[PDB]
Design a protein around this ligand. Structure first.
Ligand SMILES: [Mg+2]
Ligand SMILES: [Mg+2]
Ligand SMILES: [Mg+2]
Ligand SMILES: [Mg+2]
Ligand SMILES: [Mg+2]
Ligand SMILES: [Mg+2]
Ligand SMILES: [Mg+2]
Ligand SMILES: [Mg+2]
Ligand SMILES: [Mg+2]
Ligand SMILES: [Mg+2]
Ligand SMILES: [Mg+2]
Ligand SMILES: [Mg+2]
Ligand SMILES: [Mg+2]
Ligand SMILES: [Mg+2]
Ligand SMILES: [Mg+2]
Ligand SMILES: [Mg+2]
Ligand SMILES: [Mg+2]
Ligand SMILES: [Mg+2]
Ligand SMILES: [Mg+2]
Ligand SMILES: [Mg+2]
Ligand SMILES: [Mg+2]
Ligand SMILES: [Mg+2]
Ligand SMILES: [Mg+2]
Ligand SMILES: [Mg+2]
Ligand SMILES: [Mg+2]
Ligand SMILES: [Mg+2]
Ligand SMILES: [Mg+2]
Ligand SMILES: [Mg+2]
Ligand SMILES: [Mg+2]
Ligand SMILES: [Mg+2]
Ligand SMILES: [Mg+2]
Ligand SMILES: [Mg+2]
Ligand SMILES: [Mg+2]
Ligand SMILES: [Mg+2]
Ligand SMILES: [Mg+2]
Ligand SMILES: [Mg+2]
Ligand SMILES: [Mg+2]
Length: 124
RNA sequence: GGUGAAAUUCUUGGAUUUAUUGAAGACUAACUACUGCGAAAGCAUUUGCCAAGGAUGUUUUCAUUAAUCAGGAACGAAAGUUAGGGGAUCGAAGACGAUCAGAUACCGUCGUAGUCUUAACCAUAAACUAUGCCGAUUAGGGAUCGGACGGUGUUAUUUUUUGACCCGUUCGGCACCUUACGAUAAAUCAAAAUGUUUGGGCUCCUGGGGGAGUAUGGUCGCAAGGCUGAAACUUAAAGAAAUUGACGGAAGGGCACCACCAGGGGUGGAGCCUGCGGCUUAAUUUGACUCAACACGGGGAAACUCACCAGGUCCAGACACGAUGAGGAUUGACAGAUUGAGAGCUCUUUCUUGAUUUCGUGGGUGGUGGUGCAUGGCCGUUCUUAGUUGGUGGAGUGAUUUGUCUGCUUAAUUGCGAUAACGAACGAGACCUUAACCUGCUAAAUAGCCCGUAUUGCUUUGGCAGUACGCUGGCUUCUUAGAGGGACUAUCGGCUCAAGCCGAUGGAAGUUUGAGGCAAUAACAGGUCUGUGAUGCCCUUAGAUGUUCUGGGCCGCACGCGCGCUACACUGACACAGCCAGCGAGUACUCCCUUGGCCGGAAGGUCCGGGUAAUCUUGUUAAACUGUGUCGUGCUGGGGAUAGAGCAUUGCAAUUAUUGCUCUUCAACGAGGAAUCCCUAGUAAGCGCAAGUCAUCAGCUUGCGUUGAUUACGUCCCUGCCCUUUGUACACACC
């Protein structure tokens, strides 16, 4: 079968992890890319590397792949992480719906001032 | 009926099967559980009676009455014994039927004791939790059984109790799950912990393996036997738990035409070569004996090769010492006769050299002599499959293990991934050679094409391999050969997270594009001492196991085997005609490849010449094959074995025919038993050619081309291989 070896996969990932904007989905252009940037001196190996590189580039157009950054993702996950809604989900805006034992803890701890709504506790 | 398949057996007297009923004896299915009771052995239908028991609860009683126990006693599965009853089923022994070499067994049909019960014995089980009884302490957790307690809500009853279910606490049980502050040699253990920091109480047993739970004595038993229980003698291990391999008629997964399936072509059925043993001895030189010996030693031996007799040769015994020795000492070669002899070896004479030499003592050289079980090197094989190894980290006291893997994927330890491993090195792949593409580049009189010149034959009206190196201006499609490009699964449709897989399109090429080369760790007592001045040791070294010469032998022939050639014909044989390749080789002290002319029936002979090679042999005009005829279903014009005669060639030599040609002779063989080999596309098969060997001989091998298929594209059934789990009493490793 035609299963590519690690020397092809690992090298191609380094190409994508570094030269993503220069690469594209065209094999013929990707063929010329490997000429300038890599030192293969083996037409079969270079064709395999360009062929496997093109395969992942078409995969990138869908959201995959894990573990091959591709720094354009890195800058993207930065802005995903920084995102935050202005209204906290912990806001009480019926304010705090807890049970009999929880409110008892508030009395014990000396904080019997929270707008606590005591709910019943039963077993079905 | 019964079985892997059968048979013994029953059956038209109705077997087996169907329904109803009856009798007999045994047993108590499903419910049935990591549940219960009992001191253990054991105990599973209902009901009644009889006696007993643990746990629970207790603000009841006694007050040390307790624990363990040598002898002693009760109970004690199954089998077995005695005397009755019963006797359905099953079933020791026994009889048959199969299987098998045997089958006193496993398998099947019968079948006695027994299996069941009352009375009386027996007292042993892998009677096991292989783990004595009492007591205290020590990590967590959830189930479950019995009792008790507290709470909650449904459900059935109820003058609000009780049962079922739910949650929790506690006592007492059967167990279980994770962990190691601990234990052990380890497997593993909440006990096998609280033990070299060694003492809570009591009883029993053991002291390397056998002999041996045997002999004897005692005692119990109706008996079978039980309990108690040695010694002589023998032996360096036996044994326990784990580890890595190997093996398995163990399981899971995956592969291979040196495996099979579907097929194709063979071999095994005479004769050829000795390719392999007896016989002759000078010998039929010798090595190799499953794959991994037997057209192998590139081993197609006339002489040589040669290693298997005779005859000679060796200061082809270097060098050192001594003697013959300075009256010359030493020493060899000729001629005739004998002696094969062409060594004067013998009868004689000539030269002769002077310690170049001849003997003796040491020491060397040579040996296709032995040892491949002393070795190097090389090759083959394990093993053509995908496997192997450190470093740091983790587990284990240790051998060692993880890394190197559950799953999917791949031809692949190939990847995607999971992950006490991370990061790497080999092998695979990658790489190199070769085949297929380029009307793109480079450039060719040692390759071609077009153009033109001269000329030939028909037409003469334009067409012919037409023919002709300095006959030629241009070009490189064909040919040659360098750089390059080209395929990377490209695109599309599906499955899938991925790795990838299937189909179609385009493309010269889509199985890794086809075929090879190289090819890891470890090993074999694999082969080679007969390749080597590559060698250790042993043997021999003047009547040689050195060397050379003649002849013979390696070929000898009742017999068995292996690799092959030709055939058993009509899809054919023969005669003419048509008529197309590729890989290659070729001349110096002597002829290598050979053209053309001449002679001959053929093999051949002769003469002038070409080629040290894209130039000449050579377009190697190969064969198979196609066309037209003869033959005719006859072992026949198939087949060419054996043999007779003659003629040439190579060689110094052809006899046991080297080989070639002509005529004649015309054997088995009509498709091949039990068995067995190779093979998936330009492949099998058929057909030939060149090279190696070579003065001559190719039925052999290495390559090349021509014609060119049937059938899978799957599997683990046979034979083997790879990985994992598992078992092992194996490690010389299932021979
Ligand atoms: Mg009947
Ligand atoms: Mg019960
Ligand atoms: Mg029952
Ligand atoms: Mg009671
Ligand atoms: Mg006992
Ligand atoms: Mg015991
Ligand atoms: Mg205790
Ligand atoms: Mg309990
Ligand atoms: Mg309870
Ligand atoms: Mg219990
Ligand atoms: Mg002892
Ligand atoms: Mg003992
Ligand atoms: Mg053991
Ligand atoms: Mg196959
Ligand atoms: Mg075979
Ligand atoms: Mg077959
Ligand atoms: Mg021979
Ligand atoms: Mg083999
Ligand atoms: Mg010969
Ligand atoms: Mg000879
Ligand atoms: Mg050897
Ligand atoms: Mg060797
Ligand atoms: Mg390590
Ligand atoms: Mg370590
Ligand atoms: Mg350690
Ligand atoms: Mg290849
Ligand atoms: Mg050798
Ligand atoms: Mg000799
Ligand atoms: Mg001789
Ligand atoms: Mg052979
Ligand atoms: Mg044949
Ligand atoms: Mg003919
Ligand atoms: Mg030609
Ligand atoms: Mg020849
Ligand atoms: Mg040969
Ligand atoms: Mg076992
Ligand atoms: Mg052993």
């Amino acid at each position: 079968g035609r299963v590519r070896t690690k020397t092809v996969k690992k090298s191609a990932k380094v190409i994508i992890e570094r030269y993503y904007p220069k690469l594209t989905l065209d094999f013929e252009t990707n063929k010329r890319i490997c000429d300038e940037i890599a030192i293969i001196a083996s037409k079969r190996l270079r064709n395999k590397i360009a062929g496997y590189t093109t395969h992942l580039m078409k995969r990138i157009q869908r959201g995959p792949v894990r573990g091959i950054s591709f720094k354009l993702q890195e800058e993207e996950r930065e802005r995903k992480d920084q995102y935050v809604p202005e209204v906290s989900a912990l806001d009480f805006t019926g304010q705090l719906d807890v049970d009999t034992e929880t409110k008892d803890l508030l009395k014990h701890l000396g904080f019997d001032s929270i707008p606590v709504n005591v709910i019943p506790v039963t077993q079905a």
